[PDB]
């Protein structure tokens, strides 16, 4: 269960890292949308970037949900390990 917790914790870390990267994807697209908007002031491009940022947001959210799930798994494994240690 300790090794399980380590694995599930690793999965949480991997999903969390991926979520951080997804945030950077959304940010990069948002910055691109801003530059396109400045050029427009280009509209089609800014909208495409906004859609890409929105997709990145969905990826980040899903990854955060997976990270939380993996963390819950690690917590349950830790709880079982604690019970086993107590026994």
């Amino acid at each position: 269960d300790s090794q399980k917790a380590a694995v599930k914790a690793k999965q949480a870390a991997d999903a969390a890292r991926a979520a951080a990267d997804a945030a950077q994807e959304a940010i990069g697209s948002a910055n691109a949308a801003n530059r396109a908007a400045r050029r427009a002031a280009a509209a089609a491009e800014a909208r495409r970037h906004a859609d890409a940022a929105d997709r990145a947001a969905d990826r980040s959210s899903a990854l955060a949900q997976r990270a939380a799930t993996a963390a819950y798994g690690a917590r349950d494994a830790a709880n079982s390990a604690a019970e086993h240690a107590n026994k």
Binding site: A23, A30, A33, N34, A57
Partner: peptide, 9 residues
């Protein structure tokens, strides 16, 4: 937040 800002742009 970035997606919402991107939409605003």
């Amino acid at each position: 937040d970035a997606a919402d800002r991107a939409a605003q742009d």
